[PDB]
DNA sequence: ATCGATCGATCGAT
DNA sequence: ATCGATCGATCGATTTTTTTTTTTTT
């Protein structure tokens, strides 16, 4: 009626713009014929569903409707303001301009499109002997449509919609708007197919029923609306036919603020967004992206009279996504810069943590666990690690925590952790109530998350018992055991293990004997193959030279020089598993020799006897590992020949792990 | 409409025509609004008005706005927007007015309010707490009827609408408007306002003797939204809204939820600030002197004897220490943190009160403390509309500000582990239920602790005397032990100033420092390095035979310390001359 | 806000 | 014409809800 709900004029009109839409639709120049022709048949070809659109090309054809007239009102200035009218009406012209066949449907291919022709086979035959309802254009689509906005070099044309923004930068006037913001993903609760229109079937009168559903809910129809059952005493029964009704894949995510955008006060703002179509599964939780999409509110249900006023509360929809930080063939050559350089075991050893000065010998062993291997298979079976567990003992911090910052970063499956920090419940699959979608789904991590990869660790003395026993079992490795609740499972943890821990308070006392200084259990240290004692005595010469490096930065961003060229991880990492494919086989020559030095070590460590320097007893596990060491060391040489120097090279690192306690 | 409305509008012609100063100010808005239109192919419509002119204009219209603003205001609303049309009508919308005042009656704090003060625009001030977070709110709606076309249109009015009461009209939402065509929701042509609501507690400073403070709510809409963080000191001014039923709405005790709406809510420092020329020139004049800093030191202890070396460290902390963040790498900690320690009656906590005033950000802490301190502690459940909302604790709320800690030694170590995350990492990490985030807390911090046992803080070794092992020691850049040792020569000095107690300017200092903060960072100069390299190394070469701990982190402070004095000198560049200052206080740090 | 039952009338049957 | 059942317009009732300060045990 007039008055209430008044009809209101706006200077903007798409009536001829829809024609101007089809002027732009199909026909086009810049990219034989226009890009929109065979590409729209490309969807008619059914090798594509998602329809991708950008604001970039609209400007040129708008320039093409411009320069180059006749002059026409701009679409794009009417887009970012609404653009939801463009997600349909601009798109609704596609049935008019789309080719009929355009090729063979075959059989499969797929279902649906074989049924949808049957639905239209049933729909057209309804009117065949009938002599007039038809399937709405929205009822049969089968293809998604997307928009990617212009930043851009077009904005400096000069020409806005693409300017990255904070959640804090989100105005209320941006509702309805196709917009773009940078943000960190969060949640990313699982996607599920959602129907636009139920298909009920009358049975008795048959036909087909299509009722639209919007947002979260709908009110389902009943009885029979079919006209054959209309005005007849008998109304047919109907319920939803899921094979018939169309579905849409629906994902969603919260988007956190980058935290540099944030004000000094307040709080990071999570932003709810909902993923749909081919755009689904395009994101993971915690990833940083410039998000581009239209922003619309989805009230209400309710409540209702509760809200009031309405106070929309809205949400954002995802139009498009731009993510931040997205053989043994020819990459062997990318290995070959340092292959021709040689010194794989050193230059790469020097390649480790170029940021921290000295302790390259410590870094020297770092290269081994970063590689490790190679395990064994006894066929019993019992598999043996296979993995290096390294500990670092010294205080104060020395910036030891920094070594883990570099190592895990480079390392695949790199996981940095600390005593508290992740608990043993954090290293196990632990039941927790899932917000929104329910319920009580288990989420594991840490050890379970770090399996088949290195785990860096700090506050290792403060991990207490609950962690110690777990990692005590994590030293049994290849397992994580939970008898808790109804959960009886034991899950494989392939985790590589390294934790640096601080000596007994306040710092280590040279008078203090070994193992009295350490805060860790002996059985906990016995399954350790290596520990590097970090005790720091001031050396005026060394203090300057290191201070000099501490002078050298902040002075500049580039540390390494006079002289060296640390390998970048990507090219460096590629040699890792490339070397890990080797699996060196032991030569018996070095084989028995390692046995020889063992009974020597089984002798000398025991002849140390009571207290003092220690540690005994030189158990076979270390030899079991020391053998694996040359097996890990051989991998850097590859060649799987296991040299004796390659063997003895580890034995050199064995005594060095200790004996610095004299310093 | 009554001419009473049309006349009041008509009554607003000559004003603000006189004083006409606002006339072009809105035009100043018009231009800048046009300015942005020039570059892109930001200013709020609402304008400030000193109420005072009404006293030279209409005293009846004056107090009436104080009386029934609900009436006088809406016509004043039109003429502004109306003249706004006439001001620029060429090119092809609340336009609110603030009124700093020109107060007041109507001057009251939230603790003392109404019933008479209700339904009247009034200044009320205090803490911003707890400041409900913002949500979007629509007013206008629009639609398209296919296939007949045209365009639909719809309007909305809530309870908090405008100012005065109006008939409530929840519409559901416009659809299938006759003829019965499907109506698709249309946006951005339709109107929106993000909504905000916050309470405000009355000041504990002005709080009465034995009673608790009562925070009272106010709505925040459009620009009014997010103008301020929670916990801020600000004076809100607007009419007090009594809307909502007394239980009579449904036939079947307490009643009438109420709050003030609008208007100005001027932020208040008790930062900001104005500077001008004459003032900053004093800074420019004082900056030349290298003799100023000790004056900067002496001004710190109006009631306090000496410890000027302890004082010097304080201002150097005010500087911020020149944060430099690695490119695609982790930042080293910029700001300095310290802890006062020593025998009882040190006046260390007393000093924090000095740290507590001119500092301007931030909150202090006495022992416990928690749960969580700056932890949000997961404000929950929901609150509101089922929405989980974290509310940052002090440690987060204090970001880019000072942290003072009393009884730091008594505090539970549970949150101490977080203070490692609080200090070394210098950022907040949160997973509880819950929201999963890591948010920056870079806040500058200081604490205080007693000797572990008795008066032996002198005799017994400083280790075991720390009372809070271990890495806690590494964290603080300076720890000063306060000896309670007494001297008759000392006490003689101690008396008269304590005597004069009962019977260079300070405020100029914080203005001198605040501007000294953004201008200008000294960066780094190798010349300062040349002496200090032999210094710190030699420090590890000697002190380790004397005391500890000694770490490169202590050396890292040297860059912080010298960084600060370079600010104290207002030097565009670092100088080795500053190091001797830092090293000396570091000499005093050891001795 | 919609669904639910009461209850009112009316048009057919006996 | 008495009685009924039948449909509809009448009437009115039902729509959120668990986390941070605790405390007896060695
Ligand atoms: N430098 C000083 N100048 C003036 N008065 C001082 C000074 N040092 C100590 N005092 C006196 O000692 C008393 C200190 O009491 P206060 O409560 O401030 O101690 P505090 O800082 O809490 O120390 P603690 O934490 O050991 O209790 C005050 O009465 C103060 O006058």
List the single residue in B195, B222, B439 with the smallest CB-CB distance to A259.
B439
Verify that B79 and B120 share a domain, yes or no: no
CA gap B530, A547 in Å, rounded: 11
Are A226 and A209 in contact by the 8 Å Cβ rule? The answer is yes
User: DSSP assignment, residue B125?
Assistant: E
Max CA pair span of chain B? 100
Verify that B113 and B86 share a domain, yes or no: no
Tokens 């929201």 correspond to B435
Verify that B188 and B118 share a domain, yes or no: no
CA angle A403/A404/A406 to nearest 5° reads: 70
Verify that B68 and B121 share a domain, yes or no: no
CA gap A37, A99 in Å, rounded: 9
> Burial, B580: exposed, middle or buried (Cβ in 10 Å; 0-12, 13-18, 19+)?
middle
Give the number of other Cβ atoms within 10 Å of residue A421's Cβ. Answer: 17
Verify that B217 and B116 share a domain, yes or no: yes
> Burial, A615: exposed, middle or buried (Cβ in 10 Å; 0-12, 13-18, 19+)?
middle
Verify that B205 and B85 share a domain, yes or no: no
Residue B481 C-alpha to ligand 1 middle, in angstroms?
14
CA dist A31 → A35, A57, A60, A501 (Å) = 5, 10, 11, 62
- Residue ranges of B 221-260 with Cβ closer than 8 A to chain A: 222, 226, 229-231
Verify that B183 and B203 share a domain, yes or no: no
Phi, psi of A503 (to 5 degrees): -60, 165
Verify that B115 and B227 share a domain, yes or no: yes
Cα A624 versus chain centre, distance: 37
CA gap A74, A382 in Å, rounded: 73
List the single residue in A80, A176, A554 with the smallest CB-CB distance to B559.
A554
B443: nearest CA partner in chain A: A264
Give the number of other Cβ atoms within 10 Å of residue A220's Cβ. Answer: 12
What is the sign, positive or negative, of the torsion defined by CA atoms of A469, A471, A476, A480? Answer: positive
| CATH of residue B74 | 3.30.1640.10
Tell me the residue ranges of DSSP E strands in A401-491.
Answer: 415-416, 430-431, 442-443, 454-457
CA dist B110 → A430, B99, B128, B202 (Å) = 48, 19, 12, 6
Distance in angstroms, CA of B457 to C1' of D25? 35
Are B532 and B554 in contact by the 8 Å Cβ rule? The answer is no
Tokens 């560049």 correspond to B573
Verify that B181 and B146 share a domain, yes or no: yes
CA gap A501, A503 in Å, rounded: 7
Half-sphere exposure of A330 (CA within 13 A, CB side): 0
Tokens 């088949």 correspond to A452
Which of these, A440, A490, A452, lies nearest to A470 by C-alpha position?
Answer: A490
Which of these, B519, B509, B514, lies nearest to B566 by C-alpha position?
Answer: B519
CA gap A293, B466 in Å, rounded: 56
CA gap A558, A355 in Å, rounded: 9
Q: Is the peptide bond before B320 cis (omega within 30 degrees of 0)?
A: no
Enumerate long-range contacts of A445-450, CB under 8 Å, 24 or more apart.
A446/A415, A446/A417, A446/A422, A447/A471, A447/A474, A447/A480, A447/A493, A447/A495, A448/A480, A448/A491, A448/A493, A449/A415, A450/A413, A450/A415, A450/A417, A450/A493, A450/A495, A450/A496
Checking phi first, is residue A532 left (phi over 0); if not, alpha (psi -120 to 50) or beta? beta
Helix, coil or strand: residue B41: coil
Helix, coil or strand: residue B138: strand
The C-alpha R_g of chain A, in whole angstroms, comes to 34
CA dist B399 → A100, A402, B344 (Å) = 64, 25, 30
Tell me if A125 is assigned to a ligand binding site: no
Decide if A405 touches B, using CB distance below 8 A.
Answer: yes
Token pair for residue A611? Answer: 């207290």
Decide if A176 touches B, using CB distance below 8 A.
Answer: yes
CA gap B485, B463 in Å, rounded: 19
Decide if A189 touches B, using CB distance below 8 A.
Answer: no
Are B226 and B174 in contact by the 8 Å Cβ rule? The answer is no
What is the sign, positive or negative, of the torsion defined by CA atoms of A60, A63, A69, A72? Answer: positive
Cβ within 8 Å of residue B152, ≥6 positions away = A5, A7, B141, B142, B143, B144, B145, B174, B177, B183, B186
Are B583 and B533 in contact by the 8 Å Cβ rule? The answer is no
- First-residue to last-residue Cα distance in chain A: 95
Beta bridge partners of A198: A211
Decide if A443 touches B, using CB distance below 8 A.
Answer: no
Cβ within 8 Å of residue A265, ≥6 positions away = B229, B230, B231, B392, B397, B399, B400
Token pair for residue A475? Answer: 């030293």
Strands B216-221 and B135-138, how do they pair?
Answer: unpaired
> Burial, A326: exposed, middle or buried (Cβ in 10 Å; 0-12, 13-18, 19+)?
exposed
Which of these, A311, A48, A251, lies nearest to B220 by C-alpha position?
Answer: A311
- Residue ranges of B 451-510 with Cβ closer than 8 A to chain A: 463, 469-471, 473-474
CA gap B231, B131 in Å, rounded: 8
CA gap A417, A455 in Å, rounded: 7
CA gap A159, B409 in Å, rounded: 62
Q: In terms of residues, how long is chain A?
A: 663
List the single residue in A82, A305, A540 with the smallest CB-CB distance to B170.
A305
Are A640 and A634 in contact by the 8 Å Cβ rule? The answer is yes
Which of these, B69, B123, B119, lies nearest to B96 by C-alpha position?
Answer: B69
| CB of residue B297 inside a 6 A radius of ligand 1 | no
Question: This structure's resolution (angstroms)?
Answer: 6.1
Verify that B237 and B111 share a domain, yes or no: yes
Mutate one of B39, B362, B537, B563 to test the A interface: name it (highest A CB count within 10 A).
Answer: B537
Whether B158 sits inside 8 A of A309 (CB atoms) is yes
- All residues of chain B having their beta carbon less than 8 Å from the beta carbon of residue A506 are 463, 469-470, 473, 548-549
Tell me if A50 is assigned to a ligand binding site: no
Write down the H helix ranges in A426-516. Answer: 447-450, 464-474
CA dist A331 → A335, A336, A344, A348, A574 (Å) = 6, 8, 16, 17, 8
Checking phi first, is residue A459 left (phi over 0); if not, alpha (psi -120 to 50) or beta? left
Query: How many A-B residue pairs are in contact by the CB < 8 A criterion?
Result: 200
User: DSSP assignment, residue A635?
Assistant: H
Are A316 and A293 in contact by the 8 Å Cβ rule? The answer is yes
Cβ within 8 Å of residue A617, ≥6 positions away = A602, A605, A606
- Residue ranges of A 550-609 with Cβ closer than 8 A to chain B: 550-551, 554-555, 557
Checking phi first, is residue A581 left (phi over 0); if not, alpha (psi -120 to 50) or beta? alpha
**If residue A142 lies in a helix (H) or strand (E), which one and from where to where?**
none
Range of the domain at B214: 107-136+194-270
CA gap A262, A264 in Å, rounded: 6
Ligand 1, from B306, B314, B345, B353: best to mutate by most atoms within 8 Å of Cβ?
B345
**If residue A622 lies in a helix (H) or strand (E), which one and from where to where?**
helix A620-637
Cβ within 8 Å of residue A181, ≥6 positions away = A164, A165, A166, A167, A169, A170, A255, A271, A290, A291
Tokens 């320039």 correspond to A63
Verify that B233 and B162 share a domain, yes or no: no
Phi, psi of A209 (to 5 degrees): -115, 130
Mutate one of A417, A538, A566 to test the B interface: name it (highest B CB count within 10 A).
Answer: A538
Verify that B97 and B153 share a domain, yes or no: no
Please tell me whether any atom of strand C lies within 7 Å of the Cβ of A217. Answer: no
Give the number of other Cβ atoms within 10 Å of residue B486's Cβ. Answer: 9
Tokens 């730091």 correspond to B408
Phi, psi of A438 (to 5 degrees): -120, 160
The ligand 1 atom at the shortest distance from the C-alpha of residue B501 is 4
> Burial, A553: exposed, middle or buried (Cβ in 10 Å; 0-12, 13-18, 19+)?
middle
Whether A5 sits inside 8 A of B195 (CB atoms) is no
Structure determination method: cryo-EM
Cα A314 versus chain centre, distance: 27
Token pair for residue A431? Answer: 């039941």
Cα A423 versus chain centre, distance: 23
What is the sign, positive or negative, of the torsion defined by CA atoms of B489, B493, B499, B501? Answer: negative
Cβ within 8 Å of residue A508, ≥6 positions away = A393, A394, A395, A517, A535
Tokens 């303001």 correspond to A81
CA angle B346/B463/A660 to nearest 5° reads: 155
A160: nearest CA partner in chain B: B40
Are A437 and A189 in contact by the 8 Å Cβ rule? The answer is yes
CA gap A116, A158 in Å, rounded: 47
Token pair for residue B219? Answer: 């709505």
CA gap B475, B449 in Å, rounded: 15
What is the sign, positive or negative, of the torsion defined by CA atoms of B512, B514, B520, B524? Answer: positive
Give the number of other Cβ atoms within 10 Å of residue B10's Cβ. Answer: 12
- Residue ranges of A 414-433 with Cβ closer than 8 A to chain B: 420, 433
| CB of residue B344 inside a 6 A radius of ligand 1 | yes
The C-alpha R_g of chain B, in whole angstroms, comes to 30
Tokens 């239980």 correspond to B247
């Amino acid at each position: 009626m007039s008055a209430a709900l008044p009809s209101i004029q706006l200077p903007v009109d798409y009536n001829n713009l829809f024609n101007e839409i089809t002027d732009f639709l199909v026909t086009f120049k810049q990219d034989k014929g226009p890009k929109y022709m065979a590409m729209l048949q490309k969807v008619a070809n059914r090798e594509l569903n998602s329809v991708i659109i950008d604001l970039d090309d609209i400007l040129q054809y708008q320039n093409e409707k411009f320069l180059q007239g006749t002059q026409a009102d701009d679409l794009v200035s009417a887009i970012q303001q609404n653009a939801n009218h463009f997600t349909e009406l601009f798109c609704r012209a596609i049935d008019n301009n789309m080719p009929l066949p355009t090729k063979e449907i075959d059989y499969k291919d797929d279902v649906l499109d074989v049924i949808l022709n049957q639905r239209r086979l049933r729909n057209e035959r309804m009117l065949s002997d009938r002599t007039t309802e038809l399937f709405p254009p929205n009822l049969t689509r089968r293809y998604f449509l997307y928009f990617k906005p212009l930043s851009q070099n077009c904005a400096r044309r000069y020409r806005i919609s693409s300017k990255p923004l904070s959640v804090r930068q989100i105005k209320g006037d941006f509702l309805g708007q196709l917009i773009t913001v940078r943000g960190i993903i969060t949640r990313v609760s699982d996607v599920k197919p959602a129907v636009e229109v139920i298909a009920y079937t009358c049975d008795q009168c048959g036909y087909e029923v299509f009722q639209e559903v919007n947002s979260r809910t709908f009110t389902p129809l009943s009885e029979c609306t079919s006209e054959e059952c209309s005005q007849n005493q008998t109304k047919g029964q109907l319920f939803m036919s899921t094979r018939a009704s169309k579905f849409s894949a629906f994902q969603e995510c919260k988007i956190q603020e980058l935290s540099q955008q944030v004000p000094v006060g307040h709080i990071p703002r999570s932003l709810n967004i909902h993923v749909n179509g081919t755009l689904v599964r395009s994101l993971s939780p915690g990833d940083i992206v410039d998000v581009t999409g239209i922003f619309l509110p989805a009230p209400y249900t309710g409540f209702k009279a509760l809200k009031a006023g309405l106070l929309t509360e809205t949400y954002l929809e995802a139009q498009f996504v731009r993510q931040h930080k997205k053989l043994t063939s020819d990459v062997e050559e990318r290995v070959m810069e340092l292959i021709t350089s040689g010194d794989v075991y050193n230059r790469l050893a020097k390649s480790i943590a170029p940021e921290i000065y000295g302790n390259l010998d410590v870094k020297k062993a770092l290269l081994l666990l970063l590689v490790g291997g190679v395990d064994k298979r006894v066929g019993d079976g019992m598999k043996i690690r296979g993995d290096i567990n390294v500990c670092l003992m010294g205080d104060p911090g020395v910036a030891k925590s920094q070594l883990l910052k570099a190592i895990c970063k480079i390392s695949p499956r790199g996981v940095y952790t600390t005593g508290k920090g992740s608990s043993g419940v954090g290293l196990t699959a632990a039941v927790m109530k899932d917000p929104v979608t329910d319920e009580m789904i288990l989420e594991g991590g840490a050890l379970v998350l770090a399996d088949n990869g290195i785990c860096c660790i700090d506050e290792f003395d403060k991990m207490d018992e609950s962690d110690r026993t777990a990692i005590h079992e994590v030293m049994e490795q290849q397992t994580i055991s939970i008898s808790k609740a109804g959960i009886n499972t034991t899950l494989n943890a392939r985790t590589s293990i390294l934790a640096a821990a601080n000596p007994l308070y306040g710092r280590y006392n040279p008078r203090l004997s070994p193992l009295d200084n350490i805060n860790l259990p002996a059985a906990l240290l016995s399954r350790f193959d290596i520990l590097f004692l970090m005790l720091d005595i001031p050396s005026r010469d060394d203090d300057e030279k290191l201070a000099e490096h501490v002078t050298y930065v902040h002075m500049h961003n580039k540390q390494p020089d006079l002289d060296f060229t640390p390998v970048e991880p990507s090219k460096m990492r590629e040699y890792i598993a490339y070397a890990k494919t080797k699996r060196p086989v032991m030569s018996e020559a070095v084989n028995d020799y390692v046995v020889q030095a063992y009974i020597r070590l089984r002798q000398d460590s025991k002849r140390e006897m009571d207290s003092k320097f220690s540690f005994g007893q030189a158990t076979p596990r270390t030899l079991l590992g020391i053998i694996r060491l040359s097996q890990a060391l051989a991998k850097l040489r590859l060649a799987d020949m296991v040299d004796i120097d390659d063997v003895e090279e580890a034995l050199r690192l064995v005594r060095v792990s200790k004996e610095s306690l004299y310093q | 409409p009554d001419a009473v409305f049309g006349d009041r509008v008509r009554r607003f012609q000559e004003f603000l025509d006189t004083f006409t100063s606002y006339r072009d100010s809105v035009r100043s808005i018009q231009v800048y609004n046009s300015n942005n239109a020039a570059n892109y192919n930001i200013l709020p419509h609402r304008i400030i008005i000193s109420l005072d002119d009404l006293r030279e204009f209409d005293r009846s219209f004056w107090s009436g706005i104080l009386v029934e603003p609900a009436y006088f205001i809406p016509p004043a609303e039109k003429a502004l927007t109306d003249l706004a049309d006439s001001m620029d009508d060429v090119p092809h919308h609340p336009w609110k007015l603030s009124f700093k005042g020109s107060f007041g009656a109507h001057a009251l704090s939230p603790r003392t309010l109404t019933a008479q003060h209700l339904n009247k625009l009034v200044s009320v001030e205090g803490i911003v707490t707890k400041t409900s977070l913002v949500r979007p709110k629509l007013i206008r709606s629009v639609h398209y009827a296919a296939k007949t076309g045209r365009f639909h249109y719809r309007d909305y009015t809530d309870a908090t609408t405008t100012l005065t009461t109006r008939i409530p009209t929840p519409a559901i939402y416009p659809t299938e408007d006759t003829e019965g065509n499907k109506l698709t929701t249309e946006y951005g042509y339709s109107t929106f306002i993000d909504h905000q609501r916050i309470t405000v507690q009355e000041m504990p400073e002005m709080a009465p003797a034995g009673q608790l403070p009562r925070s009272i709510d106010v709505i925040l809409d459009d620009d009014l939204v997010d103008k301020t963080k929670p916990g801020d000191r600000v004076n809100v001014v607007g009419v007090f809204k009594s809307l909502g039923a007394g239980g009579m709405n449904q036939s079947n005790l307490i009643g009438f939820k109420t709050l003030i709406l609008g208007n100005t809510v001027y932020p208040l420092h008790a930062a900001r600030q104005m500077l001008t020329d004459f003032d900053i020139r004093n800074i420019n004049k004082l900056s030349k002197k290298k003799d100023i800093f000790d004056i900067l030191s002496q001004s710190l202890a109006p009631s306090i004897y000496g410890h000027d070396h302890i004082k010097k460290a304080i201002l150097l902390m005010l500087m911020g220490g020149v944060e430099k963040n690695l490119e695609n790498g982790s930042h080293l900690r910029g700001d300095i943190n310290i802890l006062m320690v020593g025998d009882p009656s040190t006046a260390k906590s007393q000093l924090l009160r000095f740290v507590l005033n001119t500092a301007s950000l931030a909150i202090a802490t006495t022992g416990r403390g928690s749960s969580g301190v700056g932890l949000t502690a997961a404000v929950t459940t929901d609150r509101e509309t089922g929405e989980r909302r974290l509310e940052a604790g002090a440690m987060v709320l204090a970001d880019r500000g000072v942290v003072c800690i009393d009884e730091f030694d008594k505090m539970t170590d549970v949150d101490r582990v977080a203070i490692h995350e609080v200090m070394e990492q210098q950022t907040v990490t949160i997973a509880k239920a819950g929201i999963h985030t890591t948010l920056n807390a870079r806040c500058s911090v200081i604490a205080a602790a007693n000797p572990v046992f008795g008066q032996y803080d002198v005799n017994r070794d400083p280790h075991q005397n720390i009372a809070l092992p271990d890495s806690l020691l590494s964290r603080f850049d300076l720890l000063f032990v306060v000896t309670d040792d007494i001297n008759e020569i000392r006490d003689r000095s101690i008396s008269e100033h304590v005597l004069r107690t009962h019977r260079v300017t300070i405020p100029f200092l914080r203005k001198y420092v605040q501007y000294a903060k953004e201008r200008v960072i000294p960066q780094l100069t190798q010349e300062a390095i040349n002496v200090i390299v032999k210094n710190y190394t030699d420090l590890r070469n000697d002190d380790n035979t004397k005391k500890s701990p000694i770490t490169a982190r202590t050396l890292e402070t040297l860059i912080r310390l010298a960084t600060a004095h370079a600010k104290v000198r207002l030097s565009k560049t670092v100088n080795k001359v500053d190091a001797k200052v830092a090293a000396n206080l570091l000499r005093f740090a050891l001795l």
